[PDB]
């Protein structure tokens, strides 16, 4: 349930907002995975 | 003397900082805008941008226009101009307005937040009688003769 | 939905172009944990045990034994929801403003919805990063005219019950005095048994330029940055020390550990900008849209943040 | 101990007297089956008659300006609304969110019809009212035009509600 | 309004001072990693050493008898326990439940070792202690045999806890 | 929260952590005590020593 | 971590102590630990069974 998945098709604005939040969380996780100090 | 500067710029803009990037003459409308506001448009005589407007009546062949003015003839406050059509956007004096407006180039240093303001014959705000305007900030100088100020107008007073 | 809401489709298409916030570098991956709400308060409970007496020797027969007691502490965190409105061009009216090199009305400063949303989101993310770093919300470089916020809403720079040192105005250029104040603050730090953790320092660019000077007669092959790293290693049990530069800070040094047990960021899952379904529409070509964002969620332990302010008066 | 508990009760009652919707747990339910005279309460927020196109502005507030005329005070923090009247009247407060400490104000440019705090129980129908220094409505220097639609109704020793329609300023 | 809030906070603090585990909301987590001296608090119920065969009685109480010597008082309702000493001492209250207003008490016939409220800070180790009229342990005609194991430790303006072993009555 | 009562698992975890802290303190200093001043130490058997004592 | 003592350059008391211990342990590894349990006490011992 993320906007990164092209197959995902939201049905309502609630699902759209949840997908936006999930996409933000996944981007944060990816940044911490690819972050080196 | 224009919503957008007539002369072009030789430099690109630096989009790094986010503070104090709104004190420009191109900022049209109000800082706080309600979706239930009444907005009118009128033919413009002169350049009444960011100034109090009054109704001007011609010989009769053409319709009425709006011109920079104040005092007992104040009809509203102009917040935007479409230059191609010569159209002035007006917010009536019966509607609350909060935004940046032109200030008189006399005693601008004395203008402080919480000071009563009134429109003059040229549609410029000046420190004080008939219009309830309160300055919410200090004078910001954009040009040697151009000064703006954040003010709220909430109707005529007794 | 995407076959009905063009604005939602445009937001979904343009969401990838927004850059990640810079506040992520200030915290470890384990220190951030998303929560689920928009506005209100949350409660966190911490339990701790203690011994009431010396232990008893198990010899022959005995039934009277020493006791282990328990205690709990509760912390309340307040969140807030804020909104911004921006104007844009209507989708059906975009074709009448399209040009060979751009789309939008230059003379009236009107933009397509996607571009306007992207720029507004970038500005809101900058504001959110500023709030996370400083504990204040303001749009003025002077820092005045701040928006009054709720209690239990603190940032790293305004967190109470933390060690604060002040370098005098006459010694603002004296790196030795600055380091003396830093050493005093480091000695006043109280990390308990979690002291064996990595440490993080945030400095302004001017302080960074002062640090990159050679360490003082004068010497070589060693810098003030190295001296500071060794001093912090003297307290973190020879753990890693990281240094970062932030333009938001001004003549201030922030030192804090990267341990979740001491400092934790539990923000709302809707903290980052989110579009609103309400779109104002009129008979003209100008429409209005709304963006929502949630602020709050920083928790810290007492006396674990060092704040050195160099008075520039 | 007992005196401390009594003082706690007194202070809590005094503090919750100046509250829109104080949370008082009751041992038993109340009977309000009759559908008449249920609107004259301190928690009745908003107005009796409201239009869809009414302008509402939220501002930080200092003190308790609920159901009172409010003025703008500029201090550093943003300017805030405070209970006051006279020639400094900026609007009227119609709702308060206590968690965020945010007051909702109808500006004087708009017209309002609803119950507001009165100075005392000396207000009758068809009377001209003025907002005093505390933002309370008193019987008549009327810079604004407000007329009482009902009589002052008493809910507490100082809580007086009167139905008033405010429709701008005089000249 | 704000003055009333301040008065409410003052009375709330005064009431919470006389409480076993008052409920407070804090903005920060207090840090006490050091395991030494972590047991000297007013919420540490029970005793340092507890036996499985200890006798505990729950009784209704008047006032706040927590960590104090209690005596049976007969008034109609059942008799209660009130903080007091002298020759009327019936037991010592080792636990309290304010929701049910029930005090858990060790009778005087059972020996106890734990922290109890002291009258002042003039108590040293190896000192004979007597329960006063308020149920507090004061330095010494002792009907009971109580000896302080540690010195008085101050937590609040009047909270003085001392480790004491009580093992019956004298003769 | 009012009665400071916990589930068995959490209570055991916290008690074990405290006991391990005490054991580490004993292994380091050679004494067993629960006071910051270091008084009221537990009387231990001879031939029981730490690195410090 | 204070400089070894006039203050030296790139020479600290910790480094001097490490060199001193390396002098007696045949230049073997020297580990230094900080313990909150200790207070104004320094404990030095080998790591040989």
Explain what this protein looks like in three dimensions:
This is part of a larger assembly, with one copy of chain A (37 residues), one copy of chain B (158 residues), three copies of chain C and two copies of chain D (171 residues). Chain A is mostly helical and 37 residues long. Chain A is built from one helix and no strands. With 158 residues, chain B is an all-beta fold. In chain B, the strands form two sheets. In chain B, strands 6, 7, 8, 9, 10 and 11 form a six-stranded antiparallel β-sheet that branches. A five-stranded antiparallel β-sheet of chain B has the order 1-5-4-2-3, with no helix packed on it. Chain B is globular and about 50 Å long. Chain B starts with 39 loop residues before the first strand and ends with a strand. The relative contact order of chain B is 0.19. Chain D is mainly β and 171 residues long. In chain D, the strands form three sheets. Chain D has a five-stranded mixed barrel. In chain D, strands 6, 9, 10 and 11 form a four-stranded antiparallel β-sheet that branches. Classes of the chains: A mainly alpha (37), B mainly beta (158), C alpha+beta (313), D mainly beta (171). Chains in contact: A-C, B-C, B-D, C-D, C-E, C-F, C-G, D-E, E-F, F-G. The PDB classes it as viral protein. Keywords: Bacteriophage, capsid, procapsid, viral protein.
């Amino acid at each position: 349930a993320s906007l990164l998945d092209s197959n995902f098709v939201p049905i309502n604005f609630t699902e759209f907002v949840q997908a936006i939040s999930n996409t933000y969380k996944q981007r944060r996780i990816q940044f911490y995975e690819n972050l080196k100090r | 003397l224009m919503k957008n500067p007539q002369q072009d710029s030789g430099l690109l803009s630096n989009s790094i900082d986010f503070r104090d990037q709104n004190l420009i003459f191109s900022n049209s409308g109000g800082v706080c805008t309600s979706s239930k506001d009444k907005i009118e448009n009128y033919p413009a005589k002169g350049y009444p941008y960011k100034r109090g407007v009054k109704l001007s009546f011609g010989d009769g062949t053409t319709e009425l226009e709006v011109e920079a003015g104040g005092g007992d003839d104040l009809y509203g406050v102009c917040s935007d101009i479409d230059e191609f059509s010569g159209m002035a956007t007006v917010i009536p004096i019966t509607n609350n307005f909060t935004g940046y407006l032109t200030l008189k180039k006399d005693g601008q240093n004395g203008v402080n937040p919480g000071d009563k303001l009134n429109f003059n014959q040229h549609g410029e705000l000046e420190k004080v009688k008939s219009v309830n305007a309160i300055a919410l900030s200090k004078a910001h100088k954009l040009t040697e003769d151009l000064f703006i100020v954040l003010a709220s107008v909430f109707g005529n007073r007794a | 939905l995407f076959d009905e809401n063009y604005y939602a489709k445009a937001v979904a298409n343009i969401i990838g172009e927004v850059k990640d916030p810079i506040m992520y570098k200030w915290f470890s991956p384990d220190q951030i944990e998303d929560v689920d709400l928009q506005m209100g308060y949350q409660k966190t409970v911490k339990w701790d045990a203690f011994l009431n007496a010396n232990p008893t020797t198990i010899a022959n027969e005995v039934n009277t034994i020493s006791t282990i007691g328990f205690s709990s502490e509760v912390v309340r965190l307040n969140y807030l929801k804020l909104q911004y409105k921006f104007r844009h061009l209507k989708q059906t009216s975009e074709k009448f403003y399209t040009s060979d090199s751009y789309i939008g009305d230059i003379n009236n400063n009107l933009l397509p919805f996607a571009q306007a949303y992207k720029l507004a989101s970038s500005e809101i993310i900058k504001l959110i990063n500023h709030f996370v770093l400083t504990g204040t919300v303001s749009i003025q470089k002077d820092g005045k005219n701040q928006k009054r916020l709720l209690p239990n809403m603190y940032g790293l720079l305004n967190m109470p019950e933390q060690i604060k040192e002040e370098v005098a105005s006459g010694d603002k250029d004296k790196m030795d005095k600055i380091f003396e104040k830093i050493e005093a603050g480091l000695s006043k730090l109280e990390l308990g048994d979690e002291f064996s953790t990595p440490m993080m320092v945030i400095v302004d660019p001017a302080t960074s330029l002062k640090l990159v000077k050679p360490y003082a007669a004068a010497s070589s092959c060693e810098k003030w940055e190295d001296v500071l790293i060794q001093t912090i290693k003297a307290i973190n049990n020879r753990e890693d020390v990281y240094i970062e530069t932030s333009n938001l800070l001004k003549h201030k040094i922030l030192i804090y550990p990267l341990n979740s047990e001491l400092i934790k960021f539990k923000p709302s899952k809707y903290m980052l900008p989110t579009p609103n379904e309400q779109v104002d529409k009129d008979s003209t070509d100008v429409a209005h849209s709304y963006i929502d964002f949630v602020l709050g969620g920083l928790l810290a332990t007492r006396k674990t943040i060092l704040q050195v302010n160099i008075k520039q008066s | 101990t007992t005196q401390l508990v009594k003082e706690y009760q007194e202070k809590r009652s005094k503090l919750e007297k100046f509250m829109k919707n104080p949370q008082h747990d009751a041992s038993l339910l109340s009977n309000s089956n009759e559908f008449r005279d249920k609107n004259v309460e301190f928690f009745a927020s908003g107005g009796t008659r409201t239009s869809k196109f009414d302008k509402l502005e939220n501002h930080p507030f200092l003190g308790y300006p609920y159901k009172r005329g409010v003025k703008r005070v500029i201090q550093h923090y943003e300017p805030h609304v405070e209970a006051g009247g006279g020639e400094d009247l900026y609007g009227i407060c119609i709702d308060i969110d206590e968690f965020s400490k945010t007051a909702t104000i109808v500006p004087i440019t708009n017209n309002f019809e609803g119950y507001l705090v009165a100075k005392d129980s000396t207000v009758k129908v068809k009377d001209k009212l003025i907002f005093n220094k505390d933002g309370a409505l008193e019987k008549v220097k009327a810079t604004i035009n407000a007329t009482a639609l009902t009589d002052a109704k008493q809910i507490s020793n100082e809580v007086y509600l009167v139905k008033v329609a405010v429709f701008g300023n005089k000249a």
